[PDB]
Structures are given as C-alpha cells and as structure tokens.
Amino acid sequence: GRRTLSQRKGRGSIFKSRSHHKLGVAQHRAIDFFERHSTVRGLVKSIEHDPGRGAPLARVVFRNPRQYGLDKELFICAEGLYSGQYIYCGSKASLHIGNVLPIGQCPEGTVVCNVESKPGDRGIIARASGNYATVISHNADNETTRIRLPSGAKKTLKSNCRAMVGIIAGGGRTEKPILKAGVAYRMYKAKRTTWPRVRGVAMNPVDHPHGGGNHQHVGHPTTLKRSSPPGQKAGKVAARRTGLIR
RNA sequence: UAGAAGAAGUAAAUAUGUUAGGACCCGAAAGAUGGUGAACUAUACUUGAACGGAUUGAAGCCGAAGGAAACUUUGGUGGAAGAUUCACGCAGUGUUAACGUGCAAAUUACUUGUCAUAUUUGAGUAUAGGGGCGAAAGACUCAUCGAACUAUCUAGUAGCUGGUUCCACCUGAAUAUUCCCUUAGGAAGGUCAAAGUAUUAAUAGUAUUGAUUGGUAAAGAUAAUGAUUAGGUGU
RNA sequence: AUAAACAUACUUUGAAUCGGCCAAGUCUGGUAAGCAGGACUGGCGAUGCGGGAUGAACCGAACGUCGAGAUAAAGUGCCAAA
RNA sequence: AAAAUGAAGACAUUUUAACGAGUAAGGAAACGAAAUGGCGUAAGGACAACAAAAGUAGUAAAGAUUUAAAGUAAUUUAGAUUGAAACUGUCCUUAGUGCAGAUCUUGGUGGUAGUAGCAAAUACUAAGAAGAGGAAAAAAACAUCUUAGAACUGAAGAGGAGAAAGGUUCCUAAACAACAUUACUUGGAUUAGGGUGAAUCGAUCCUAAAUUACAGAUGGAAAUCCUUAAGAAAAGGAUUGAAAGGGAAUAAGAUUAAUAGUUCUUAAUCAAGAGAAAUGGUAACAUAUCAUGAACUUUAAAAUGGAGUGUGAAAAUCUACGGAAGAGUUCUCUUUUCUUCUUAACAAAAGUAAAUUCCACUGAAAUGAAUCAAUCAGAGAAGUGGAAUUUAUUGGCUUUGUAAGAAAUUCAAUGAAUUGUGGUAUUUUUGCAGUCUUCAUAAAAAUUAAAGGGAAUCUUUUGCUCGUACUAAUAACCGCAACAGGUCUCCAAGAAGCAAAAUCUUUAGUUAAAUAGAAUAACGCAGGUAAGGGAAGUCGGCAACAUAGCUCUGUAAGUUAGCAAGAAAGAGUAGCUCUGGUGAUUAUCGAAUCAGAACUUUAAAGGUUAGGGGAAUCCGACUGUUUAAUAAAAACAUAGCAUUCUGAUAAAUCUAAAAGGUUCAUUACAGAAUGUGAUUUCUGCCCAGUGCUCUGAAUGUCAAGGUAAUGAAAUUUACUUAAGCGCGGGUUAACGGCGGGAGUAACUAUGACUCUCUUAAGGUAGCCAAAUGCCUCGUCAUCUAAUUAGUGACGCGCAUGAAUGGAUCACCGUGAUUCCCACUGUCCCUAUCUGCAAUCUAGUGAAACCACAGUCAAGGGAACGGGCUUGAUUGGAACGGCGGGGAAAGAAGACCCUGUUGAGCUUGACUCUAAUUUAUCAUGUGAAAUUUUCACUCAUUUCGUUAAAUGUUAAAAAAACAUUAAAAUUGAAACAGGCGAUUGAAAGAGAUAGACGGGGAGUUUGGCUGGGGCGGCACAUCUGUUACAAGAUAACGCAGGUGUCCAAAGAUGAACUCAAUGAGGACAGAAACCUCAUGUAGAAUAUAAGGGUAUAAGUUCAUUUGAUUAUUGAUUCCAGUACAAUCAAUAACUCUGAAAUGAUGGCCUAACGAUCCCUAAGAUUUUUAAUUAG
RNA sequence: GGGGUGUCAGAAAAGUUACCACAGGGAUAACUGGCUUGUGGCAGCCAAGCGCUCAUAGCGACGUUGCUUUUUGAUCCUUCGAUGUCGGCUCUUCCUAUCCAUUUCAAGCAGAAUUGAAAAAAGGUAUGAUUGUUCACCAUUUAAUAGGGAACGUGAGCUGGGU
RNA sequence: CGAGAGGAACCGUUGUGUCACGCCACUGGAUUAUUCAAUUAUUUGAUCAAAUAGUGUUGAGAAUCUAACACGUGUUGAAAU
C-alpha cells in the first residue's frame, strides 16, 4: 500500500515545528566557578508568554562575573515569581522559591523543577505547566540523590545536578474543557502539524492497516509487538493490558 | 537386437522441411532503468490585502421597591457568541431547465445555500513516483492517477483477431487412434501431393463351392434364474 | 466365376486437417425439440447443372469450348416448352 | 499412355485411344520426344544491319489519352493525338518483383450541401463628407467620420490607473491581396517611420520562511550530510532569498501625434565631501549648530493580533447668509433652475482646539471625581496653575510665505474683471482614548539616536548602472480564437432606502461588440395570464402559484432552562392641512425622529426589493469538510470519553551511509500510537481460540560456534551453548463470542415451577417488522370513502443489543419519510399574448455518416429481407414537418465466458526481504570465586561552554553602579604533562548463525462441465448392460467395484463330497450331536459382477517354499513407444509324488507408476605379474 | 530392486476486485426471435354418478383426444469491432377464446333477476387510496367497467420511480 | 304474470353523455390596438405632455383567436342477408 501518516511524519516536511515566534531556549545558565562555589544574583526583568508552551518564561538578567556586561538569561517561571525579584543561583543559595540550587543541598521532601538529568546540561525534567519533582533521599557515599519524577518513576541523579526550587507556573491548564474545534485549531498555532486526526478505520486498505471493508472495524488485534516494522505498528504497542482500568 | 561379409564418400550453388534469431505484416494490458514536473490541484510555513447594514441581547455596572439577613422584584446601561440574516463576492441543492458536432474538452439562466476567525485571498517557500499530499472521495499531484509525464530496454510476448499482391493446366483432402497443465493449441498416426524406383512369392470394399466362428432379431415361459392372472386333483 | 500392365509393390520428403453438419424401412437420455449423443452407408462442407415456386443436404445427375439428336427427375388450361 | 520419326522443321513433331468438376494443399529452375506451360516490374553480364560504321531515336525516346489486332488468360503489338530525350527485343543472373481489402500509411477528392448555421451582452435614426463601392420597376438592409435625435454601462461601472503575463500590440502616414462566420473606406490586420529622459519612483541595500559554497563527515559510485558544529577558515560568523515586509531625500502648473512624481518654468529636500569644556526652570522640562566627548556596556526606535464603542481633524455630498459671471425655461407661472468661485511640496507662527500622561501647592469620609461603557484615589483623588506628546510637512485647525504672476468662469479684439463667512447634518479617510478576547500573545536585520564612562587636548562641488511606451481584459494575459470560462489591487456622485440591495440618473465610456430584410405557419427556447374545481396529475406538490417591509397586540407543546420564536394569529400603513414631545447659546439658532387629530380619495408596504406555515418519524449533536467533470450525504472532521508505550543516550520515525534528519527553540499538564464521537442515563457475562504481556520457571525442544575422542587424515561421533516455541499467570473501552429439549397452575390459553443435555460465557439493561424481520402487504389500533405508505403498540428477534458503543432528542440540517392549512394550468382540458428562432430572400457557409442503395405482403434462408421466389402495385424533380424503419450514428461489450494475459488489495497461499531481536568473533589494564564477580581509564559513547578557576598544596528588605587600576614583576599565590563532566571495556557500526517480520518484493490459485460457480469424477482403473451375433465403439447413460487381503488363502500328493429335503435316535423342542436315503452343484471358492470347477479349482490331512537365479522369443493396450500384464522355451538349484507329470505366486477378468535425486544387492567361476623345474 | 508423482506418461502453488485492465468469443450465459409445449391457458369424446323422480336444464368421476404461445421451463441457431434492459405516460392497429349494446335457441325460463349456446369484432369498455411495480386488494361509478398480440408494441417519443 | 311478495315489453314523445364535422351571434378566457384611465420610483425648473423600470403595475378593455366554459348538424331512406 501507501506510506502511513506516521511514516510521513519523520521526514521533516510540513510536519516541522512551527517555531518562528518562540522566545528561545529556556534553561539554566552555563555552569562555572561562581555557580559551583558561590552564588550569582539574577533580576527578573519581565515575565513573558512563549508561544507553543503552557508556562510563562522569565527574562532574567544576570551580571557577567568575569567580564563587563550582562548575561541575559531565559528561565522557566516558577509559580510566585514577580517582576523585580532577585533570584540567586549557586551552591550556597538560600532555599527559597525561584532559587537555583544543586539537588544535593535540597532537604529531603523539597519540591523542585527544571532538574538536570546530567550535571551541567541545563534542565531536563519537570518542565511542563504545574509540574514538579520531589527529592526522595540523599546518598553521600556515591554523591547521588533520588528524585521522584512527575510520571511517578524514581530516578537517581548526581548530587551536583542543579534545579529550581518550586512549581512551574501555569498549573491547571488542561482542566479547562476545549469546547470548539476552532479552539483546538488555535492550540497548535506554535506546534507541529497533527490536529485533525482521521480514524484509520475510515481510511482505505492501502493507506492504513486498519483500512476496512464493508463494515468499519479493525479485524485483527490492535495490540502489537514492539518489534513490528514502521508501517504496521499502528494501535497499542507492547500493551501489557487493555480495557478500562479498575 | 550394433557392425563385418572384395570400401562410397566428399565439396559447392540452389529448392523444400526443422530450429534460432524482429522472423510473413500490424496489435496488448503490463515489467525494468534513467530523468522532468506543485504555472492545475493538496497540505504546511514566511510576508501582505479584504468585514458595510440590520436582528437577538451573555456576563459586568446604575436607579426604584421589598427584606433581620441571605437576597429578590422591576427599569435601564453594556455589547458577548466558532449567535440569526442582507450586500460585494463564492459554491453548485433543484429544474434531473438551456446547450449537448456547445459561449464552454463542465459553461449559461432562474432557484437554493453560503457570505471573517476551522474566513477568503496574492506572492515567496517546502514536500516528488511503491514517493508526496489527503477534515479520507483511492481524492489531488499541469484536461493524464486503484501508481504521473518523458526516453531507453523494445520491432517486449501473444496457443488470440485482422490482412497476405500474376495467368493457365494436373492431382486433390480432414473431424478415427495414442500422449500432453490437454479442451480456441501441439507431437506420433490416418487421408493427400510431389519426387524416385522394382519385372513383380507383388491384385481384389465382388460372387460361388467347402469346413467353421458368433448369440443379435426372433422364440420360450414348471426348459435353468427371475416376474405375474386364474382353473382342476390329492393330503 | 468376374475383373486387373498407364496392373501391382512401393520407398523418401512434405502440405493441409482432426470446431463439423444433414438424411434414414436405425439406436440411447428426454414430454419433446430445427435438443444431446452413438452403429452402417451416402452426401453438404469442397458443388455447380435440370426438377421440387423459393431452400447446404431432397430427386436426376456431377462440369474443357461448341453443333445435332435420343433421354433422367418431373411435367403438358395460361404465366411455361409440352 | 503407347507406337513412328527425329540435328533443327515447328505450332513444344506424327498417329490412335482414354480422360478434363473442386475449398484447404501440392506440383522451384534445367532435362528432344523434355519429372506442368507461360505473362509482367526493375537492375547486372552478353547478343541485336556479318562485306571495315553493325538494335531504335529531333524525319520525334520514354510517358499520358483512345482506336484496332494477336493470345483461353496473365499480357503483347500497331495507328492517331499529346509529349521533346532517351529507349527497346532475345539469353542467362539477381531481387526492396505483381494488391481491392489489414478502423491499413500518406496525399487528394466527392454525396450530404448552397443544407445546419452566421439568434446571450435592450438600438438604432436623419442630414452632410470621403470613397469604385445605394444602386432601384422598394434591390425595404448601406461599413468609417462630423452634427442632431434617441439610448445603454450606472459610479463594488462597459470609468480613470497598477502587479503578473504579453512584447511593440503604443502614435502617425500610405494602402485593403489575406484575417475579424456579410461587408468594411475600420482594425489589436499589411507596409514605413516615430516613440520609453529620474540624485528624490522602483530594482540596487537588509533580512523572513527557506537556499547554497571551501574545509570536515559519509558513500563502490554519482553524489549526500553539515551552515557554524567538527576548521590555524569565516570583533564574531559564509552565499542567495520580497518591484506587496524594512527603507535618506519633490511638489504645483505647462508641454508631445506618443514620455513624464523622469522634460520645461518656478519653488524645495537628502547624502558624501570642501572653504578642564554653556545656561534657564521648585518641578515636569526649555534653549536660529552651539555650549568637546574615544574604547567599552546598556536602553529605545525600525517593530507588530483582532473586535466593538466614543470622538478630534480633513475631503466628498447636503445645507444657511451674501453675492459676481455665464447658461436653460418663459405666453401659463417661476425675485426662477443649472455651472465656476481653487491651490502643492517645503517652511512660518497673528489667533485658537480635542485627547492622554506627568509637575508644584493642598490633603478627601457626610467619601468624592467622572464615562456611551468604564475607571480612579493617603504608593494621593477633586480644585488651581503649569510641562510634554499625538492629531496625513514644519506645530492639529483657520491664517501666512510659495501665490496669483498659476489655474477656473466670463468679456473684448493680446488685454480686462471677480475668487466672503458659517452648520449641535450624512459618508469616507486618518489619528486618539480607554473596554473586550485568546490552552492564539500576534517577525528579523540593515540603519539611527540617547545614555553610563572619562580617553585625547553660510558659500560651493558631485550624485554612476538598470526599468519606464501600451493592454491589464465581453478584443493586447491563460484556455488552439476578438472563446458568455478564469485572473490580485487603488480612487468612487445624486434619488430612495436600515442597507455599497433592486430601479433611474450626472462626470467618464460606448451605440459596436460570431450579418441583415420580408412574412408573422407548425414544433420549439425565454417571459406571461386564464372561467368553475383545487394535487383528483405524479415515484414524489418536480415546476409554478402563494407569504414577504415596518409598528402595535399576542405567542403553545417541548427543553440541556440558554431556546423554541420572526412560533402560530390579528390589526394598522396613502394624500393633504395641522398639533405636541425630545436641545444649544443666553429672545436667537438647529436635528431628524416619535406620537396624535380633522378632511379627501381609485381605502394606501408591494413599481423594485421582500419569510409560506403547522403535527410527527429516522440519521448526524452543533459551526465546518468532501469524490475538479453524474454521489454534498446519514459519509469525514469535531469537542467529549477511553486505552497503550516512553524519563529523553527515550518513544514514534525518514535515510544506502553518516560528528545525519523530524516531533524537539520540546521534557509526562509532554511526545507518539489508536477506538468511540456533544450533553443526560449506562456500559452487562466470557481469558477457552488468536493476539499482547509477565515484575516469572527450568534443564522439553532449539543455530553457528566451543570442547573431547577414534582415525594417517579429511571425515565421523559424543558433550555443552542464546533468543524463540512449549510449560504457568494477567489482560476484552485487545480481535472477538454470548445454547437446546420436554412436562406442568381447580374450563380454554399462557407457564411463575421443576426435569437434564451442555458452554470459556450462554445476548444482561435496554430497543424493534427499525436505513437492522425471510415468512411479510406480520397482528391490533390510528390516519383516508378506500392505506404494500406513516405513526402508536405486541415480540421465541431468518440474522437487534451495549466506546464495532445501547437507550434518549432539545436547538440545528440546500439530509431521508408521512400528514394537514393556504395557493395554484400539476390536472379535468386546453385556450391565448410577447421576444428570439424555425419559414423565404441577398452575402457567407461547415460536420457526423456513406458496400450499392432505398415502396409492401407471404415463403424459404444464419429460424425478424431493400435486393432472392410468388404476388400487390409504381410519373420524373422535390419543399415544410415528422419520428415507424434503415435490427440508424457515437465506442475492437464495461455484463458472462475462454486465455496457462495482467494490475490494485488481503491473508501462517509458496519462496524471499528491509526494520526489530538473540548468541559467537573482532585482544585496554589490575585482581578474586568457580569462565563469572569485581576496581580503574586509555580507546568508545552522550553531553557544555567565551574549552573562563578542574585536582592538590598554600594563604532572600531596595527592578541602581560596577569596564579602559592606583600604588609599591607583584597588586590578581603555586604546580599537574587531564578543557570540564558522563558512560566505559559494556553499549554502538561489521561478519556469521537462530527467531520474528504482508511493512515490502516475485508468483500461483488443475481439468471435465447441456454457460460459469456450488455439486459430482464420466481424470488411473474392473464386471454386467446400452451395443447393433468379427474387431472398434458415445452421453454428468443404468446396476455396481479398486488403491486391498493371504506362510497360507502359494506348490504338490492323498482321502472325501457340497446346499437342501425325507425318515429315525434319552434329555433334545423349529434350531445342538449321531445314522440311512435322494441330492448336476440349487454349496464353497477373501472381495464387485460375470465366467470356471465334482475321484475338483470345494472340505480335511501331510510334506514344502518355484512367491528363486541367468538368457531368449512372442501376445494384450500399442504410435505396433515406455510401464504394466499375459504366455512359450532354455541353463541351474530345488519342492511334492511310486510315477507320468505339476510348481517362476493367488482359478480368470482390476488391485497401480518416467527423467533427475536418495538408498540397498551384485560383479570373487577368470585374467595377470613375480619366483623355481623342464 | 525400494523411496512417487491419485491432475495416476508424472509443475513445487491461497483469495478478492462493485476501482478494475487487455487479446478474443455469439465455440458461451443474462433480452427478443425460432423448434418443443412438460408447466400455464382454452376446448373436446365416453358416461359412474349429482341434479327430490331424471346419466346429458346445469355438471360430469375413472379414462382419453386436441389446440395456443398471452407463464415459466428445455436447447443455444442469429447477434459480444453493442439490436439501449422493467414499468408508467401518449398513440395507432390487429385477434376472439365476447364484458355491454343488436338478432336468436335452450332452461329445473310463471313475472323480475338470471344461466348455457349460435350469428356478429362495425362501436364502447371509466375515476381513485397503497405499491417503482406487472400483479393484488379495497372505495365508487357505469349499459359494461372482457382477455390478449404488434422485437415481453412504443427511450435521436417522454420519465428515471425500480433494476 | 303471480296465491302473495313483487313486477315488464313493442309503438310514440322528450332530454342527456360521448364521438365526428363545424362555427363566433349570445356567455366566458387570453389581449403589446403598451386603446382609455389611474398610479409607485427617476429625469425634463413648475403646469401640460411624456419618457425610462427589456410589457413598471393596476381597473375596464374593443378586434382576432377560442371553450373540455357558448351553440348547431350527424333521429336518414331502399334492397339483400
């Protein structure tokens, strides 16, 4: 048959990201001595709206500690930040909302966000709206600490991985029911080309494996092995279970 | 069962037959390989352009009256909605109207619908052939799409259809049998023609006489195997 | 007994063909069929001519170009020779 | 065919006799008594006046047209005419050698046929001019130009201009052969000239989506990737990308046959050049350059959605007062109706605005201030006084310079006159202020300015390159064209009206845009009306009719409480003369809007524009999308609901590969993959089967490898190995599924109830003759006079049913169905009106189709003749209609079947394959347990930065600033052979091996057949019969049979006689066992049927293995091939019998099988060599 | 010799196309026509009986002989380089196996209403609800509301309801 | 005729329906004699007179055509069956 819609998605055609009005890459600043063995102070100049993402972005401004000028950064807002607030980033920073601390200095039970999976990689985990990761325990024997990811999974990271103390702003975004197809159309203004999704059973046998006959149905089980080739991998993949959960 | 038994073969020009090659001439739907295309249409992005008149009246706000309170009744203000309609436009529901060698290789008239946010639209730009694009009809990808266009392989193959060019003279057929992936076709064989021989235990789709073979027509039915209507005699 | 020397025996090479159809003092399946399928022979196909008004097969009889006569099937009131 | 003659005659000899039809097919050449005979086309080698000028030809070749002759024919010969330079006859040789067909190719030409047509876009007329081109017994029409009449587009135009595209189509002159469906003096047509002027408009400059280089990386290759990451490359990152984004700077008048923000006059602007460092104000802030301001850093501008309301200013229209000039009307009036009364870029500052934001004084409550709405205040309202910015250039409007000298309107014959002031009116444009809305927040750079810091100590010149004409469309672009189709924009008057609607008009444009004139038939296309009845027409109210604006009253069931709703329904509306309400300025001035009252009439929305309404059922929730060119929908989307995987070095996924690419400028409120389709109510039972999964088991089965053994070695053998499958569990909002019989309640039904077969579970809640029910037009009500229709019920429901979603409908729908009211030519049943055609004429002028053609009946025939046979009957040429025929035209039937012809799609069809997966190999160091587990980093992976303090020693009050160092190489500490982390000898890419893999590639899907399919095997095969007394022999003809069975059921010898019947014998009888008699097979013989058999071929007894080896010759199917079977002998060794004999499987007719490949048995009877003796 | 090809002189082989394509076919089906007439329709002969008596007013069993092509069968002769395939609407003609009107005979014909039969096809034979329907069934009206053919009459005559 | 219930026919007279042929007097319908009149919108300065809205529209509307809507004729005679 044809190449299904999932195959056509990996080619980088019209399915490219609609990132033209985006503000930029949101991350911590690059690690240095003044962050490893001191604290640098940042000023939250403004809080802006980055298209395509649900959380506001803070236009933080630091001072260059080795040369003359400014280090205009772009952080992800923690809930409660306000314009003109001072935020301190470093190993000796105080445990306040918005401060950037290595994950080893946070007491067990601290709620953090924008955590680095690897030291110095400028933020990976807990970046969506209203999300956060909790610190579970420390292990000074091998300099590793345990955190609980927003998916519930537990992850062990190095004790010098940085994080922002608090909650990502914009929580409760997905609790408001979209009511109209027009509203969902505007949701993907700064996203990829995915929205109007035709059911595979409404397709033809050439287009999709579900492309059916005289009655709209599937015909074969929709739970498939992980090793299925691209093209026939349509439906539920490696499904340990199905049906409504109890 | 091949051979020998006082060697016959060879060469070249023709004719006929078999075989391979374009193969008596014309004919597929297809397959592969390499290139050209988004000036039509499909979707996406960048940068521009285009809402005039009415209908209805959501929160929010203000007065009056009633109330212990919660608040309620009533009159305004406000101008929301993928709200209702008209217009410039656009589409194509009906007439299954006109036309149907047309104005037109899809148009015209009235009617109908729709007529700014899932809107309409120009330019630039991106996506290309077992690929793209698709609010999904196998739809669209330059009047070409259930796999575009163009050139080469390629005069592709065809047991199938059509055609196959001067005269006179002589001879003149076939539908049995065996085998086939065989049943619209082949090979062995029968019928036929043309060449070339042999003095030749090498004549007969006939009748007669003679010795035979057979089990058909007929015939039989307490003659064998069966089928079937009755009438006497005896126990 | 009759016939047979352009008799007889062939040898070699090869063409086309194996869709058939009709008749009947014949048969089988079928109610039956201008149906389907067979035995024997003769025909049409490959075939014109005279007759049946006309007709692939029926009847007479098979064909170089003509003249004259006797005929065959069948006919002789007119079309139409008698 | 036979005789006779026979070197040359000639006619392919002479005589006699017999014969001669023919499709497919054959008879090549030569061959004297000739093994068929000849004609024609073209070229090659010879021959052609025999006596030394040797075929024909300017005294007319070839060719063409005909007249005659010869030949059975193919053809040849000659004359005449035309033609004017080459050609012919015979013999061999050679071949691109003979045409009526191929829907044949190319070219030309007929009938149709002077036929169909030259009918959308309202429309032309008179006089004159030019011209060959309005003549004439009306030849009724006449192209271009001027004037007059009459008209249309109607200012979202048939107007004035651009982008794309076109490319000279632009202007003028000469000229009309061709072209614009007649004509043309016209033309976007022919010929020849002319025409496009920029410092200010654009391109050029910048960047957006995106695009492309050197080096690097990848690739067998072409080439691909990377775009600043990999680089000794580029303070920081290369090229291209916009005539609609950003952008230094120009206007008015005049001018040309044509160019003008481009030329001329006048008047401007811009850029690049040349000739210890200021005041004022309390403050917000202000000063014709002034009044210094480097490196470095920051801020702002360029540069930012949309809606709606209010309002400032300008312009257009309208209007008030005063006029000046011209024009129209005027025997009826009209102090009247119409036109003109204007002003640029750039600057100035008499006078004077609206809105917003700040500053100073003061301190608000009895809270005030304010808007159409809002909104605001002790982080300070209101008040008073100030400052700033915006308002199409300076500074918004009037005004001024430019500047009246221009331009407009008149007058005179170049010269003269005038060029006030307003509006609480409408529209457009351009700004401003707040309000609303987003799970949408609505570009970048070139370039410019300011700030922080304090390093250093007016005149004039020039402004280059390219585009510039014209159309921009009912004739310049794309559709074959002057095509009713398509194609992005700017400016935009009056009436009337809610309206940029319909209708009419002014400025501008045009009267031609594929020809007309006469007549006024039929049938048409477009627009209409109609008596009485009112859907009776019809599949169906299809088409048409009908309602239609505004004001007031009134408005149901149902409902998601928002709607339904313009529900439904009723009344009013004209003209004229009046009355009253709604304000501003302080009596004057002004706005369209509402209400009311007399009177009149032809009783009033209706010229134009302008909803038909109601009661139900089904589907989809809605707005939206869809098969360009027959399907617009119930289909797709949708929001909502639900499920699966993934912690980013991941999931999905593109690529041959890749420091490769997409979601991802991302991070579970995320990314990817699916089903159902709003809301309400609810989603029942089933894990057996197939999927998926497991956090799971070991010693069932499992590869290449590894190890070990024997052997001279290859080889062989044994043991051990991962995933996978198997074993066990989970999962259905995973694929899916969700029974049968019988009996029983005081009449008749029905069966609450038991019985028992059975499943993984037995269809649960619901719903129903449903868009789902065969029977079926189900049964009962209701709708109608009448109901295969609709609706409401019943439900053992062929074959309803729960996210393949079940039930439910409020609003909504160019969706499907039924019924009412109203209205009507749908109909009873047709009449009639208009325009354009059709008819005839002048000019002009095709196409489809065509074997030849064209009166009937019957017969026969290929079973439906125009032709043939027999009759009926006919006068030649035809015009307007017409739709019976020509089995009319269009198209190698698209339905069905046959091809050993395909293609799309599907699947544990066969054979493979990319992706996925598992094991082994590919040697980093240092150790411990029985190779595994450890520790490190050094290859390797994944990352981050300006490779910016690594390692080891040493010593949360404040949205503000931080840089170019003083001082004495320090100030500002040293070293490591690690830029910093992460993984790490594991993972990746390679090879080999196992699994999985319709994601993908290639191919196949027998035959016979009263069409094919389903059924059956008449396909290999035997018996009886059809079957016709030799042989052969049909049907999907009839009655049946085979794919075996047998160490005895083979061989032999001997003995015996069978089935049945009668008569006897204790139990014993109809049937037990014994005896006699009769007994032609009526028994038995493995089997289907038919044959054979009595001292047997049957039963019993006994021996036995001939059911063996080797070699020949025949018979049956037969093609006289193979296989198979049937026989006759010979040479061995044997069995049985006294022996003759018999025995090479079964009493006979069926019981079966090639090439290649695999796998067993056999080849010692004999021949050699060497060595002794002769 | 054995291992086998059963499609048995012996390929290694699953479906579906209503999206379909090509070479062909009347060697071959779906429609008319043609032969046949089982089936359908109509008509006869005999006379066991019914018809209160009476085989034949009216019927006529058990048997038996025909005709028709208006049903469906049976066949495959023509058409596969195409004969436009149902019904309805409009219109003409033809058959008689006559429904009415005309003329007659018979009856178990008293009258009226009827029933059987002969001459006769010149003239008439309707309006609607439901269904695409042919067919059917209802409600009326009429003197009667008969049955059929013409390529199952009639698509360059219409419609497009069904297929 | 019949017990009764019920219950005809021939001649004669008069009408209706349909079919066919006609016809325009009376009744009705169409009507671009854009006839006569009225009137909405636009434009002629107003009155008069018109024009435009492809026939602006409405009322009456002759002629001509026509009726299933008006009205006439086919009641008609001999012979042979």
Side-chain angles (χ1 to χ4, degrees), chain A residues 30-134:
Chain A
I31 208 92
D32 47 20
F33 178 77
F34 305 97
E35 278 225 16
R36 281 189 281 250
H37 301 101
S38 165
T39 88
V40 282
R41 175 177 90 189
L43 156 72
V44 190
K45 273 289 300 273
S46 91
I47 291 155
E48 311 225 292
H49 161 102
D50 189 36
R53 99 200 289 141
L57 291 212
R59 276 197 178 289
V60 193
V61 163
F62 290 83
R63 264 255 150 200
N64 219 345
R66 52 199 81 84
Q67 269 199 284
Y68 181 60
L70 292 179
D71 271 16
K72 273 173 240 193
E73 287 302 318
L74 194 61
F75 285 24
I76 300 190
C77 261
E79 162 155 347
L81 297 203
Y82 55 98
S83 274
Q85 195 186 358
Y86 288 132
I87 57 173
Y88 303 85
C89 311
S91 33
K92 332 291 275 163
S94 40
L95 191 80
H96 284 95
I97 303 278
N99 280 5
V100 170
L101 274 73
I103 212 57
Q105 318 291 339
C106 301
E108 326 174 341
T110 319
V111 159
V112 299
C113 54
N114 210 9
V115 203
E116 312 189 326
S117 69
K118 255 170 48 173
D121 84 357
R122 330 256 288 286
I124 295 295
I125 325 160
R127 287 167 67 93
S129 298
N131 275 110
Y132 63 107
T134 321

Side-chain angles (χ1 to χ4, degrees), chain A residues 24 33 39 41 59 74 94 110 122 134 136 150 155 158 162 169 181 193 201 213-214 217-219 222:
Chain A
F33 178 77
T39 88
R41 175 177 90 189
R59 276 197 178 289
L74 194 61
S94 40
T110 319
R122 330 256 288 286
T134 321
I136 289 294
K155 196 162 184 190
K158 321 296 275 214
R162 278 173 307 165
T193 311
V201 302
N214 295 351
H217 66 343
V218 183
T222 61

Side-chain angles (χ1 to χ4, degrees), chain A residues 147-155:
Chain A
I147 53 151
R148 190 212 291 275
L149 310 176
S151 59
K154 314 266 207 73
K155 196 162 184 190

Side-chain angles (χ1 to χ4, degrees), chain A residues 144-172:
Chain A
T144 45
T145 82
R146 277 248 289 198
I147 53 151
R148 190 212 291 275
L149 310 176
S151 59
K154 314 266 207 73
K155 196 162 184 190
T156 294
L157 307 186
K158 321 296 275 214
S159 78
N160 40 322
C161 283
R162 278 173 307 165
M164 184 174 227
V165 187
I167 285 269
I168 311 271

